[PDB]
Design goal:
This is part of a larger assembly, with chains A (about 80 residues), B (about 45 residues) and C (about 40 residues). With about 45 residues, chain B is mainly α. Chain B has helices at about 10-15, 20-25, 25-35. The termini of chain B are far apart. Chain C starts with a strand and ends with a strand. Chain C is of the alpha+beta class and about 40 residues long. Classes of the chains: A alpha+beta (about 80), B mainly alpha (about 45), C alpha+beta (about 40). Chains in contact: A-C. The structure holds five RNA strands. Chain B: It comes from Vibrio natriegens NBRC 15636 = ATCC 14048 = DSM 759.
RNA sequence: UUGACCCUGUGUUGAUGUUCUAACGUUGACCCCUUAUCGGGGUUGCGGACAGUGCCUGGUGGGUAGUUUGACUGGGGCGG
RNA sequence: AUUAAAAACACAGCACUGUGCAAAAUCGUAAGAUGACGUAUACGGUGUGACGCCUGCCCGGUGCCGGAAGGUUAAUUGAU
RNA sequence: AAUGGGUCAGCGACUUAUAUUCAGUGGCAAGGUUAACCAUCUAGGGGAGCCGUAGGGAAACCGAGUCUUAACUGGGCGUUCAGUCUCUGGAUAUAGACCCGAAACCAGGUGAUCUAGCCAUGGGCAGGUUGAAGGUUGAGUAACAUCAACUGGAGGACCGAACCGACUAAUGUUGAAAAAUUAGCGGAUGACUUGUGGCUAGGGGUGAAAGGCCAAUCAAACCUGGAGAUAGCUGGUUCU
RNA sequence: AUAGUCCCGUAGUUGACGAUGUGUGUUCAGUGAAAUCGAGUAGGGCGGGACACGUGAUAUCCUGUCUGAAUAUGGGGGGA
RNA sequence: UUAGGCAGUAAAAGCCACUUGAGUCUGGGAUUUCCGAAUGGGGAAACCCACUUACAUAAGUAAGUAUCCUGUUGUGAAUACAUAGCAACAGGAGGCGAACCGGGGGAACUGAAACAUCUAAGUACCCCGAGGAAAAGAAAUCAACCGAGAUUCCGAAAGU
């Protein structure tokens, strides 16, 4: 699914709102991207489907902490 | 004149049979519904 | 992204020099190849 | 290459073009999982910061949808 | 289907047009499909409708295609 | 000679809850009354609150006054009259709100055993005609080309059964039949027809295109739910 | 046929081997558990949504997108 | 527990029992075909066909054999290591159920005497996940310079 593996950001629902204030349902999708992260400890690339925010989090926390978090959540990484 | 009911057993089973109902979520919903209603016959 | 150069880079700077780089440069080149590290 | 700004030519940013590879693409090739025209991983080639996607944004948009389209009236419409 | 069998539809033939292949187009949120295990002598759309003789004038409108100079113009930016 | 009623029996239409207001009745009275809750539970506790007891002004605020205005000779409203809580009733509000009735809209399901198209695998097509290309042997040409005879067996070819269809008429129309029968009629080796099994599903499919067909239903299937939609309309509305 | 006194019951009084449930201790083995006082966080920009509150002068909350502190000398709120 | 009992329709029949093995009642054991989550594979539910291992000698019998998740053991690619993969084992799960609960999605009719903001309504419905309840909960809360002290539910304030 369109779900960030790092953050959990999934598609949320909201309204489109015209000038006439007509509300149509819409979705707000996460800016999901796929990126291969080299993980030193495991001497491998790990391809993650993550939001661009997720990448920023991996830049702050490093891949090793994030991989740990994910594996705990039962992400298959 | 050819009327609408042109039975074959196989087509009856493959469409309305138990294993057909049980295969899908919405089919199981039907079986459960009929079982709740008290229907002697759950499937055709 | 602030990074510590673990070697001399053409323009960035010398070994042990702290420099802001674009996060792509760090993420995709400098850090993967050991030319720098995150300036935590 | 060039614009702004910065000081005293200099940096700091912005375009623009070329080149590059390292993100990313690959519905090229080969290897393995593997008895597999799926998929994944590996290798390599070709591309390459383009494409593509998310958020925002202008346009277009009967493709689709919800609706509106007055009253009087010597029927009603037309006219008034 | 059950008041219309026809001059209506189709048709071979014709023409315009899209489409360079991860084709266009269509189904689908997507993956994936059809197109096609095809590749411009192909595929899709549109009209015309065997065959013969032919198919005039108008590009103002509205499409579509092309052109970009200038004018107008969104998010954005944030000078005063 | 407008509607409805064949008849009888049975059933079938102004309700209920909550709040506002008016009236009657009762209690208490410048007071009246408690709510949840507690409770040895229709008692009794419980004063939170509500109404009344003051009005004027947009308001601050003032207050038997106040507001207006710079100020009223003024002027507006008020002053000077019993309320309150039960019970019963009349209205009203919110709820299906007197009962019955749409065409429709939406959501989730069920249907391609009919029919449309397609897919795969099987089958069917009496009998009779016509005589394409091609070939052969004679000609014939420089060689072609060309000619005759024979052969050959083409075709959304011809006639015509099965089969598929449905042009006309009559019957039938409370049918033998919710589309037929009888006499004729078209196609009948094909864009044919048929069996079995697959696939496509409702703003969806499928359509040699008729808005045709998608189970005797289709300008948006059927079922269930929202749902007692809504109905400024029609009907009906029961003793003296 | 219409029952205090016919019957079954009722009031009252008794009954559980075993099996269950409950509540207490007294134990065990876990769990709570995220470790270590909270940063991609608070706040911000854009788009939405929730708060009685329809973007209004609109505080507060949530966040799809883009950003991004301070860190008790600090920070949040008290409806612009 | 005690004079009758062998279910009913439902009579017959053959029987049993009579102070306690007649029977009945309660509890707990045993047995418990096939189908069904259905789980060895398949399947037109109540059927068909297996493998493994034991046994049998004949052509049978019994047991075992799902998937996933989690963990642990082994093995174990492409490249060394390794990882993926593969296997074994253990422990879970799956289905059903009227409502209540939390969450993910989410109408329209209708009302507005038309209608689009708005309403209906975060309702109906679909989905996921519980539990005997759930959820919430121990102030980065209110208040107002006085103070209060988590959450939930009920009465008022107030149709303000």
């Amino acid at each position: 699914s369109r779900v960030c593996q790092v953050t959990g950001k999934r598609p949320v629902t909201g309204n489109n709102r015209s000038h006439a204030r007509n509300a149509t349902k819409r979705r707000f999708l996460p800016n999901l991207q796929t990126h291969r992260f080299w993980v030193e400890s495991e001497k491998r690339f790990v391809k993650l489907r993550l939001s661009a925010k997720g990448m920023r989090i991996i830049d702050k926390k490093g891949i090793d902490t994030v991989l740990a978090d994910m594996r705990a959540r039962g992400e298959n990484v | 004149m050819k009327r609408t009911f042109q039975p074959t057993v196989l087509k009856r089973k493959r469409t309305h049979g138990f294993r057909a109902r049980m295969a899908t979520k919405n089919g199981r919903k039907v079986i459960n519904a009929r079982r709740a209603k008290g229907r002697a016959r759950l499937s055709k | 992204m602030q990074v510590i150069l673990l070697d001399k880079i053409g323009n960035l700077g010398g070994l042990g020099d702290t420099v802001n780089v674009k996060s792509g440069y760090a993420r995709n080149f400098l850090i993967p190849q050991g030319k720098a590290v995150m300036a935590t």
